[PDB]
Amino acid sequence: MGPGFDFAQAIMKKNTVIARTEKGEFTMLGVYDRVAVIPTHASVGEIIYINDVETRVLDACALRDLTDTNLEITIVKLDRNQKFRDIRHFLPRCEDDYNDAVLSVHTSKFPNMYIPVGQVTNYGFLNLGGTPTHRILMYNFPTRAGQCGGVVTTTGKVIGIHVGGNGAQGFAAMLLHSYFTD
Q: Which domain holds residue 122?
A: 1-15+85-182
| Domain closes at, from 58, 84, 110 | 84
For the annotated catalytic residues, the residue numbers are 41, 72, 148
CA distance 106 to 26: 8
Pair 95, 171 in one domain: yes
Q: What is the dihedral of CA 97, 100, 105, 111, to 10 degrees?
A: 180
d(CA 50, CA 34): 12
Note whether 5 and 95 are same-domain residues: yes
Domain count of the chain? 2
Q: 119 to each of 20, 129, 135, 141, 146, how far by Cα in Å?
A: 30, 24, 16, 10, 21
Domain shared by 102 and 144, yes or no: yes
Q: Give yes or no: residues 106 and 126 share one domain.
A: yes
45 and 91 belong to one structural domain: no
Q: How was this structure determined?
A: X-ray
CB atoms within 10 A of CB 1: 8
Question: Measured between alpha carbons, how far is 107 from 10 in angstroms, rounded to an integer?
Answer: 17
Q: Are residues 62 and 146 in the same domain?
A: no
Q: How many CB atoms lie within 10 A of CB 67?
A: 7
C-beta atoms surrounding 105 within 10 Å: 23
Question: Of the candidates 68, 84, 100, which is a domain's last residue?
Answer: 84
Alpha-carbon dihedral sign for residues 114, 71, 41, 44:
positive
Resolution in A: 1.4
How wide is the angle at C-alpha 76 spanned by C-alphas 173 and 104, nearest 5°? 45
Q: Decide if 62 contacts 90 (C-beta within 8 A).
A: no
- Do you know the residue count of the chain? 182
HSE of 99, CA atoms in CB hemisphere, 13 A: 0
Q: Are residues 118 and 140 in the same domain?
A: yes
Instruction: From 57, 84, 111, give the residue that closes a domain.
Output: 84
Same domain, 62 and 95: no
Residues 8 and 92 occupy one common structural domain: yes
Buried b / exposed e along 4-17 (16+ C-beta atoms within 10 A) = bbebbeebbeebbb
Nearest-angstrom CA–CA distance, 86 and 96: 22
